[PDB]
């Protein structure tokens, strides 16, 4: 609303009382919505950061560990005197007290500012909350109205729900702030936001019941994703842990049932799977043998920490990152190649691109004992024909058009490829799998299509190599499978 | 035949939706706001009670001046109830508004993105030429 | 009845006779009253002033348990107001007598008829699923043979012009040889004149 | 309602965003210390730093006369940012390159490049009280407007004896008030330093007399108490005087 | 959304039959996709249709060709669309191609002797092959009952293929009113779900469910209107013997007050 | 305190409700001028209105009957003509003992009181539950029938269209087949003319490789 | 003597110039480790009140840390951290700048106290009808 | 001849007490020739001699810095451990430091956004109790409103 004018209440935010807390918090939060006019801009701002990355472990630290804060019978907690000193004491003769000491009867360590994050000792990994946006119904049947509701839709009778709705509302306004260049006053160098992001992922997921509404959750996961999305640049510090995270945390969405695991999205509902691929990609593009190469250690199948890892995938039961295809296999097709035109496309086509380009990029990362093959009755690939669809547009939004149609194209002859290489390399498999591939009406664009083609548009030099050298691998396969 | 008055069977069945009641069955017992209101009233007329009779006692100066102290601590103390009762609502209020954080309402928090722009797919795009360039120039 | 209020302790009888005193004929001035009494702080008369009973008032339900609310009045909600006797013991043996209750009258919860009707469906739905399937990979295969046959058609057709396309430029080296369909029979009866020449 | 978060501040106004306004002038800093602070200085702490500054002479145009310690464990601080505090502490126009604060550092950063605290005196060896070589320490001060003069023993040998002590001590004259201890110390830090500093570019520094300017510069065994004009040097006084400085 | 379709998750699956009428609707999802892509594979299949001239075996529109044709591609007769096809896969074959547009192509004799007369011989060149086209769609294409068959053609395919759009449309609205039913008979397995889960608690110690019930229902009647902190702690001993955050917060109090 | 019946009052009583069974009204006209009530609460052995509880403020009343009501309501509402509960009725030493045992001023017979209606409650709700679980197999049921008229109406669409596509495009392919194959006949055989034609020609100066051979031979000089 | 009215941001009403508080340690804790004998919390509360003391004097000006500086040091470093530190809190030169104003009046007011609905502790604004005088009541 | 602390009752102004050497050892490491048990004695029996002359007042160190010229550094040392022990300037009650300072006491606070000072409730009444008077309304009176009157209801009723 209005009043609410200064920045500073940082230092209230800063200060230990639950009262403070309060004051601020919700304050700012409203401040933050606010956008007519209302921004959060950065002169001396970080402060603010650092404070709310601060406030939110500690909560969910002693949340995790089932713990109270703000009330206790101790205070100002440590030494309190007026002793014999005026400035500079505490030399040698101190020894001469002990001396005193013994004729009157007639060096620590410091921790650092946050807890430790994982290796909490009550909190270890049990396989808990892989489960779908279909939980959406799960809320809607825990916030129906029964005779125990056990929402308490007012304030904290008990502080359980207090601390539950504190962390709610820090997530939310830490959303909100996330909206604008100072995305790099986030970016992944507010090493406290860093520490809050991986704690607070490790238990939603690995999450030993302390939270009252699963409606909260949803709106953890949900905000999460989003301030995720507005990052992009570096992450993944003790990076494993939480890429295997940020993996899940995508995963959430999309309905699951080898073959593909799931039904592409009927997209009317959501706009949150959106996001899931936006940040698969933007936070993955960064080819520094890090992030790429903690995926690549994700293909396998302190020091504690590496148990954890295979403690979860095995945890997770093969492979498991065809899961990861079929969820970018989603949002894409079904629906513009089964409207009543190819001018509503344009909207979400704007949103495809990144994940065709996310999906050839990590097959630069699969080039070992697997079985993997994805065009079994699964998709097919209508790529062929929404290819042709935004070419027919071509000749008849922009700047995205022609490179999609191109990574597709690619797309289809590196998967081909490297699927038919696997299985010559592993040779677990009869040659029928030429025939097997041979047998795709989704597949090879008709020679008589190639021809007309390489004569209207003669705009397309390059897609046209590329159809070109699709046809060549056809007419390869065609002839070396006898 | 009839005797003026009517009965119930117990052969009917049940549309299991029903809105039908009837003054058949005798729940009297319709105790709410009576005993509530005669409860509270009779709090305060005991009390009432205990103020004149403590009064009374210490006004009988023929009682010992150790009874009487204690009668008049006790009028002091009832006669200055409603002021501690009034200032703990103030403060009770205080404390309590310290567990309200928007659990009341719950607005939208800026879910801009409906879709990502032009500018998140050609920043992808923009992000991995420019790596892999600087990959190649790594070596030259 | 007799109320007493010389119950406290770490605060002396003449402590609260004097904070009482005060705040009677000194309306609730904690700095006055503060100095008006020994050496405590303000806040600390203000607090234990704060926990003085008046216990004589509270009796130990249905309203006593709920205030500016309550449960409606036209039904058998006196129920409530008879809330608890013997709550837990109570209950537990009319859960024994209920579940016994449940027992002797009842000399799986459905009837046979119904599970008859219980594994047709089960029969029902195990053959739509087989019919579905069968027709499903049986239409696949039916696809997959024409596709495969069909590009079959077409490398055969381009093998072939190919060819045609071959012998054509093998024969034009051959007429190029000749320096010292209708084209085809010309230029072999072209070679053949110039043979009898 | 009130108006209150910067100084009596104001929370009633035109419903806008200000980010703390808190400077005297250009003062706010506590950006950035939390985790750096932290994890620096949970560890030892050791020898500290005298140092003088001068910049008043003819040269460029200032007061700069004041002396100040110095942590040379530390890592913590940008030094040119306390420079500039500093001077904007010393309400100098605000214009600091006329005001050049890169000079100040540099004399500050050469001063601090000279320095090894006490030798092995304390970095290997450990002598009970030290061994010998009480230096006639002689500092004179101009505080307000009286200055101060006293010579007496104090040792340079001996690490188990801190300056300030005879700072607080010597405060025990008609005030000493605040101000004036903290340059004696400094002095003291200052004057015993170049000369096991000096020490240091020779070689005793574990072994006992040295080489030649040592001689003289030094006190004796001395057997017994002493006279009363010798020592008649030690005493202290304090005088008014207009000044020629 | 996700409700709106189904919102089968835990019911406590008593008589788990929901597993299988889930499988059902799964395999409707199945053929869903499977006439969806029936109907892109028809498209398809169409595709080449209207492009194709081949069938002559079982006006008349085969034109003959020229004698550079006939010593180009060996026929002698038909449309100029197969010897253009033709040709175009010939510079793919000998490659005379150029590629910095690409349409230039290195002249040839076994070309350029299909036009001689315009000096084509003063210069062998890398040119369009679309001028070839234009030159060779009339100038070596000349002359020198089955009328049904017209009709057996690319038109049959997409008449049936209307067909069978429109009778899958004749369909739908019955799928329509069968999805307004589950929708409804979904929405009332909701409730008596609900109903039981009440009842079933009930069952289990009426004492602490009738407590809670009650009190649920007092505190609904409140929220929908007015609400405060703490109906009771007018027994002051309990609430401040037994909590302490009063003195502090008492204490931030006093300072203003 | 004893209660106004006789001996073959309760004999009738015990009689009849053997025979008839929790139709209160019912047994009760079989002992005219008595409440359904009294009959039940004697079986119960209670008397009526001589004792809140919990709420030393009770409702105002001068002449009424408030908590044996609901009481009894509850009661006859059980219909568990043999409740196994508190002592039951087989013969009248059960209430001399029940007597001899009933002692408390009332918190006896509070417990008492709230066990049948914990009794009641829960034979409702067994019943309830029932039907409940009855109602959700019904829904279930219907839900399939729904997912069979799908099931069916695809079927139809699948057999058809599909069936009429495969065999089009059969033909198609076919036809296309053939063709092919005497479009090649016809070339064949051109060529093989053609070769015997070089052959004369060469000679007086597949088998494409013998061609070529004789052709380079014959291209040496 | 006192001679100045001195107020402070509340939040900060946690410090008391007698004790310290785990807030400053968590800020401040070079001087808890107990590793650097020449350091502990007794000349940091020296230190801390002493400089309190001294703002509060005269705090209608400003204060500098030279200032302490040239008074008394054990340190630059520390003593420039802590006392930047309390800036922050604005324990020590907050109110160097006064700020002033009208304040025209609106309907809510700080004497305005009547009898209306109440969110507080419980109110019984109907008391009793006629038949409740019916009961034996509590003599 | 002079009282002192009751404990420190045992001085040695003639001898070195194993506690002395204790306290300090740096004048017994039989290394500094400059230093001796022998002048530490000197230096203490001075002291402590000089301070017997006229204890009603206090003396400082300094003047040992002016008397002996020895390490400073040991005479503060020693002379601090001495009124440790009160061995000296046990009769004094001055020579204190200046900050020309002491500890106040006054305080305010204000930190306004909305929620302390009150989260402004609405407004409320009530300091003081009432009365009922419904007890002469209840009290016995043959003109009872309906007491005397619901009294003779059940008597001609009751039949």
């Known amino acids: 609303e209005l009043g609410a004018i200064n920045l500073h209440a940082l230092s209230m935010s800063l200060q230990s009382k639950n009262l403070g807390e309060i004051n601020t918090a919700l304050n700012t939060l409203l401040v933050t919505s606010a956008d007519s006019n209302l921004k959060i801009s950065l002169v001396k701002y970080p402060e603010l950061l650092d404070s709310l990355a601060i406030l939110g472990m500690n909560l969910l630290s002693n949340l995790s560990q089932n713990v109270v804060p703000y009330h206790r019978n101790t ?408 | 035949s009839h005797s003026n008055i009517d009965y119930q069977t117990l052969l009917a069945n049940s549309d299991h939706a029903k809105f039908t009641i009837e003054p058949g069955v005798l729940p009297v017992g319709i105790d709410t706001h009576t005993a509530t209101d005669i409860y509270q009233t009779l709090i305060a007329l005991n009390l009432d009670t205990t103020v004149n009779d403590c009064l009374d006692k210490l006004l009988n100066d023929e009682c010992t001046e150790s009874t009487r102290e204690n009668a008049l601590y006790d009028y002091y103390a009832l006669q200055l109830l409603p002021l501690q009762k009034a200032v703990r609502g103030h403060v009770l209020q205080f404390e309590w508004h310290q567990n309200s954080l928007l659990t009341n309402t719950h607005p939208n928090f800026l879910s801009k993105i409906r879709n990502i722009n032009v500018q998140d797919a050609l920043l992808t795009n923009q992000l991995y030429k420019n790596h892999e360039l600087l990959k190649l120039e790594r070596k030259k | 009845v007799k109320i007493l209020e010389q119950i406290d302790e770490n605060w002396s009888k003449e402590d609260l006779q004097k904070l009482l005193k005060g705040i009677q004929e000194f309306g609730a001035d904690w700095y006055k009253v503060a100095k008006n009494v020994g050496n405590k702080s303000p806040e600390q008369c203000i607090l234990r002033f704060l926990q003085l009973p008046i216990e004589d008032k509270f009796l130990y339900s249905t309203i006593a348990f709920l205030v500016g609310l309550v449960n409606p009045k036209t039904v058998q909600s006196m129920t409530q107001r008879a809330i608890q006797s013997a709550e837990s013991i109570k209950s537990q043996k009319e859960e024994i007598s209920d579940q016994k209750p449940i027992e002797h009258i009842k000399e799986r919860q459905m009837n046979f008829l119904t599970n008859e009707l219980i594994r047709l469906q089960m029969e029902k739905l195990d053959a739509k699923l087989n019919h579905l399937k069968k027709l499903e990979k049986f239409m696949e295969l039916e696809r997959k043979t024409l596709e495969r046959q069909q590009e079959n058609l077409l490398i055969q057709r381009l093998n072939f012009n190919q060819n045609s396309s071959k012998i054509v430029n093998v024969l034009s080296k051959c007429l190029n040889l000749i320096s010292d369909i209708r084209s085809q029979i010309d230029h072999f009866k072209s070679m053949l004149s110039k043979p009898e020449t | 309602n009130g108006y209150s978060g910067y100084g009596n501040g104001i929370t009633n106004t035109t419903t806008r965003v200000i980010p703390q306004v808190e400077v005297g002038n250009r003062k706010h800093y506590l950006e950035d210390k939390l985790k750096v602070y932290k994890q620096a200085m949970n560890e030892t702490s050791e020898q500290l730093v005298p140092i003088r500054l001068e910049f008043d002479q003819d040269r460029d145009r200032f007061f700069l006369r004041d002396t100040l310690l110095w942590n040379k464990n530390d890592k913590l601080i940008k030094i040119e940012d306390f420079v500039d505090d500093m001077l904007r502490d010393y309400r100098f126009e605000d214009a600091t390159r006329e005001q050049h604060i890169d000079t100040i550092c540099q004399s500050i950063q050469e001063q601090i490049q000279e320095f090894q605290g006490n030798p092995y005196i304390e970095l290997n060896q450990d002598r009970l009280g030290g061994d010998d070589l009480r230096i006639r320490i002689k500092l004179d001060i101009v505080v307000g407007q009286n200055q101060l003069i006293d010579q007496f023993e104090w040792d340079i040998s001996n690490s188990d004896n801190c300056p300030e002590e005879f700072a607080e001590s010597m405060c025990q004259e008609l005030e000493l008030p605040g101000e004036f201890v903290t340059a004696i110390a400094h002095s003291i830090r200052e004057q015993v330093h170049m000369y096991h500093k000096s020490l240091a570019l020779l070689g005793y520094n574990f072994d006992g007399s040295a080489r030649s300017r040592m001689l003289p510069t030094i006190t004796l065994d001395d057997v017994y108490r002493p006279a009363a004009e010798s020592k008649i040097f030690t005493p202290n006084l304090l005088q008014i005087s207009a000044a020629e400085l | 959304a996700e409700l709106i379709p189904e919102l089968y998750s835990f019911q406590q699956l008593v008589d788990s039959e929901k597993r299988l009428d889930h499988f059902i609707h799964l395999r409707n999802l199945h053929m869903k996709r499977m006439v969806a892509q029936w109907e892109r594979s028809k498209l398809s299949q169409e595709f080449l249709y209207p492009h194709l001239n081949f069938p002559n075996v079982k006006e008349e529109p085969f034109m003959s060709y020229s004698p550079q044709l006939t010593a180009i591609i060996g026929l002698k007769s038909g449309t100029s669309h197969d010897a253009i096809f033709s040709i175009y896969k010939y510079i793919h074959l000998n490659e005379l191609l150029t590629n910095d547009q690409v349409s230039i192509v290195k002249l040839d004799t076994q070309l350029i002797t299909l036009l001689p007369s315009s000096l084509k011989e003063s210069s062998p060149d890398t040119m369009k092959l679309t001028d070839l086209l234009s030159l060779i769609n009339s100038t070596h294409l000349l002359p020198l009952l089955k009328f049904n068959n017209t009709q057996r053609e690319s038109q049959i395919g997409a008449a049936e293929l209307n067909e069978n759009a429109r009778e899958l449309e004749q369909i739908k609205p019955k799928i329509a009113l069968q999805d307004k039913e589950i929708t409804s008979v979904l929405s009332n397995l909701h409730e008596s779900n609900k109903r039981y889960r009440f009842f079933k608690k009930i069952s289990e110690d009426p004492v602490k469910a009738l407590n809670e019930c009650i009190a649920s229902t007092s505190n609904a009647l409140k929220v929908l209107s007015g609400d405060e902190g703490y109906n009771e702690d007018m027994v002051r001993r309990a609430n401040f013997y037994k909590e302490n955050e009063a003195m502090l917060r008492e204490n931030i109090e006093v300072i203003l007050s």
């Not at chain 1, 007026?82 to 360590?109: C, L, P």
């Not at chain 1, 991986?198 to 909260?216: G, M």
């Not at chain 1, 097997?436 to 664009?445: D, E, G, R, T, V």
């Open chain 1, 75 to 482: 205070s100002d907690y440590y030494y309190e005197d007026a002793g014999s000193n005026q400035y500079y004491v505490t030399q040698h003769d101190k020894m001469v007290d002990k001396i005193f000491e013994k004729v009157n009867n007639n060096v620590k360590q410091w921790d650092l500012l946050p807890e430790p994050i994982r290796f909490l000792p009550n909190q270890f990994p049990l396989k808990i909350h892989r489960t779908p946006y279909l939980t959406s119904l799960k809320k809607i049947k825990d916030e129906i109205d029964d005779p125990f509701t056990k929402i308490n839709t007012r304030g904290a009778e008990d502080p359980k729900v207090l601390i539950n709705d504190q962390l709610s509302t820090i997530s939310m306004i830490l959303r909100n702030i996330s909206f604008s260049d100072n995305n790099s006053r986030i970016m992944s160098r507010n090493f406290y936001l860093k520490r809050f992001i991986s704690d607070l992922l490790w238990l939603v997921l690995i999450h030993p019941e302390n939270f009252t509404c699963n409606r909260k959750i949803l709106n953890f996961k949900k905000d999460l994703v989003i301030v995720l999305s507005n990052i992009s640049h570096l992450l993944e510090i003790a990076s494993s842990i939480d890429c295997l995270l940020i993996l899940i945390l995508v995963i959430s969405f999309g309905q699951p049932k080898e073959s593909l695991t799931f039904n592409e999205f009927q997209l009317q509902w959501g706009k949150y799977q959106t996001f899931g691929v936006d940040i698969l990609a933007k936070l993955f593009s960064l080819e520094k043998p890090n992030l790429n190469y903690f995926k690549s250690i994700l293909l396998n199948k302190n020091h504690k920490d590496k148990k954890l890892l295979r403690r979860l995938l095995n945890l997770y039961n093969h492979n498991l990152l065809n899961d990861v295809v079929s969820f970018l296999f989603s949002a894409i097709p079904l629906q513009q190649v089964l409207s009543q035109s190819a001018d509503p496309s344009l909207l979400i086509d704007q949103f495809s691109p990144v994940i065709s380009q996310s999906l050839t990029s990590i097959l630069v990362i699969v080039q070992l004992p697997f079985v993997w093959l994805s065009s079994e009755e699964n998709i097919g690939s209508g790529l062929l024909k929404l290819s042709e669809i935004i070419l027919n547009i071509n000749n008849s939004y922009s700047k995205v058009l022609l490179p999609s149609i191109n990574i597709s194209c690619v797309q289809l002859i590196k998967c081909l490829v490297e699927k038919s290489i696997c299985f010559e390399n592993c040779l677990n498999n009869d040659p029928e799998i030429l025939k097997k591939i041979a047998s795709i009406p989704n597949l090879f664009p008709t020679d008589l299509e190639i021809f007309q083609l390489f004569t209207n548009p003669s705009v397309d030099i390059q897609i046209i190599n590329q159809y070109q050298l699709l046809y060549n691998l056809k007419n390869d396969i065609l002839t070396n499978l006898e």
